[PDB]
Amino acid sequence: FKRIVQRIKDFLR
Amino acid sequence: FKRIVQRIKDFLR
């Protein structure tokens, strides 16, 4: 789940 | 949809 959150954060930054 | 994207970004910041 940490992987999934960081991917969304990186897509939107 | 801009508002929705900003709500996700702000939740994860």
Author numbering:
A (entry chain B), B (entry chain A): 1 to 13
Paper text:
There were two helices in the asymmetric unit of the crystal, with 67% of their individual solvent accessible surface areas buried within the assembly, indicating compact packing. The structure of LL-3717–29 lacked amyloid continuous sheets with individual molecules stacked perpendicular to the fibril axis, and correspondingly did not bind the amyloid indicator dye Thioflavin T, in contrast to the cross-α amyloid fibrils of PSMα322. Arginine residues are lined on the surface of the bundles, with side chains extending outwards, providing an overall highly positively charged molecular electrical potential surface. The fibrillar assembly in the crystal structure created alternating hydrophobic and polar (positively charged) zigzagged belts on its surface, suggesting interactions with and disruption of negatively charged lipid bilayers, such as bacterial membranes. The overall stable assembly of LL-3717–29, which includes a network of polar interactions and hydrophobic packing, corresponded with the thermostability of the fibrils, as visualized by electron micrographs after heating to 60 or 80 °C. Alanine substitution of Ile24, the most buried residue within the core of the four-helix bundle, abolished antibacterial activity against M. luteus and against S. hominis. In the hLL-3717-29 structure, the lysine residues are almost perpendicular to the cross-section of the pore.
Here we demonstrate that the active core peptide of hLL-37, containing residues 17–19 (hLL-3717–29), formed supra-helical highly stable fibrils that interact with bacterial cells. Rather, the fibrillar assembly of LL-3717–29 was comprised of associating four-helix bundles, each stabilized by a closely packed hydrophobic core.
